[PDB]
């Protein structure tokens, strides 16, 4: 009781020193204390469910969809299927079910996985801050990673909340992802939404700029090798000198376009490489998260009208015909009334 | 499921042949005089 509190207190401090140690092969940290169990729980349940789960009544109409490999799927068609529309947004842990058999029929695995997964990646983001602080780095890698985290959160949590059901969250599978995208286009015209267009500029541009930056640095590597060696051996890990001639690279790119379209400042250049895809993904995540509340893409259906009043179709009206085809066919047994209002 | 009867050997050789090529190259690199 007396000095025993100090033997407990230094033991706590030893644990804190181990948790926050810069010398663990994989950094643990306080965020890792939450991240490690939740990612393991989500991974284990996902792998078992993807292989072996029985069919799931995703749309609450006693029409179970098979997602697992053992129940007739391959890698492309398989999924962990979202929880039942009868559940809606209700919290459905294992212990709310009368049995594992019931839990499986109703899509319990989906909720367990997405909730542990989302805790896990939020803590993964915090952990990226934490290690940078322990290493004496600047802190903002976690801000770049907030873009994919925002996007995952949009499709697994925000969109279900707005629509009132985790049955409308993105399925954990390849063909289930495409299903989510197609129904999303039918119900929100996401292609005509400027935040998704920014998303596309973000990833098309990110891929462009990745190839550009990669090619320009590779183009100006300083000769340190013979023709029978990979040029990669011309760089030694941790060397102080830069390994390419950025003056040569800038001299190329400034003539490819014009001088002032080219970065000569490596810090400005690398900030741009970070900001462009990150901002594009932020906006497309916000697109999903605001179409979650049914503020949808631009609607120019029948916007062009002739002198008499006849509609003159545009390409927007052709898009509308494709959206209609998906609208009228999706969840073909689930609607009883004329409007799909969520 | 009625899958293609050659799908299994196609997948096995697709994995095995290029993986073996890499393993051969790697091991004979390690064994070279350092």
């Amino acid at each position: 009781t007396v000095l025993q509190r100090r033997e407990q207190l230094n033991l706590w401090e030893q644990f804190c020193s181990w948790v926050t140690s810069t010398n663990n092969r994989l950094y643990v940290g306080w965020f890792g204390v939450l991240m490690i169990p939740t990612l393991l729980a989500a991974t284990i349940c996902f792998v078992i469910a993807f292989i072996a789960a029985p069919p799931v009544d995703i749309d609450g109409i006693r029409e179970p969809v098979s997602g697992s490999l053992l129940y007739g799927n391959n890698i492309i068609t398989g999924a962990v299927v979202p929880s039942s529309n009868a559940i809606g947004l209700h919290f459905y842990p294992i212990w709310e079910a009368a049995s594992l058999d019931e839990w499986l029929y109703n899509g319990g695995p989906y909720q367990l996985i997405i909730f542990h997964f989302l805790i896990g990646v939020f803590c993964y983001m915090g952990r990226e801050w934490e290690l940078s602080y322990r290493l004496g780095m600047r802190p903002w890698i976690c801000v770049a990673y907030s873009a994919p985290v925002a996007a995952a959160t949009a499709v697994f949590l925000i969109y279900p909340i707005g629509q009132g059901s985790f049955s409308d969250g993105m399925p954990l599978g390849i063909s289930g992802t495409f299903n989510f995208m197609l129904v999303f286009q039918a119900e929100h015209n996401i292609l005509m939404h400027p935040f998704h267009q920014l998303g596309v500029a973000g990833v098309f541009g990110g891929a462009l700029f990745s190839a550009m930056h990669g090619s320009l640095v590779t183009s100006s590597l300083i000769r340190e090798t013979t023709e029978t060696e990979s040029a990669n051996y011309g760089y030694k890990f941790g060397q102080e000198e830069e390994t390419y001639n950025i003056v040569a690279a800038h001299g190329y790119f400034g003539r490819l376009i014009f001088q002032y379209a080219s970065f000569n400042n490596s810090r400005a250049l690398h900030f741009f490489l970070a900001a462009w895809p990150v901002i594009g993904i932020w906006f497309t995540a916000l697109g999903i998260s605001t179409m979650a509340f049914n503020l949808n893409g631009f609607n120019f259906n029948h916007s062009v009208v002739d002198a008499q009043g006849n509609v003159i179709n545009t390409w927007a009206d052709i898009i509308n015909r494709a959206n209609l085809g998906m609208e009228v066919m999706h969840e073909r047994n689930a609607h009883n009334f004329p409007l799909d209002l969520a | 499921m009625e899958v293609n009867q050659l799908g299994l050997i196609a997948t096995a050789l697709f994995v095995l042949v290029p993986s073996v090529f890499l393993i051969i190259l790697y091991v004979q690199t390690e064994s070279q005089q350092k």
Binding site: R25, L26, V47, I51, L69, L70, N74, I75, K236, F237, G238 | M1, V3, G7, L8, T11, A12, V15
Partner: peptide, 30 residues
């Protein structure tokens, strides 16, 4: 047989993750 094949490839990938992390060529400053 298909399920075995898919799970086998997946399991090999997880094993590869293990070796690529814990049995990597150690980065060395020279």
């Amino acid at each position: 047989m298909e399920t075995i094949t898919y799970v086998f490839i997946f399991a090999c990938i997880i094993a590869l993750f293990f070796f690529a992390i814990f049995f990597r060529e150690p980065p060395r400053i020279t």
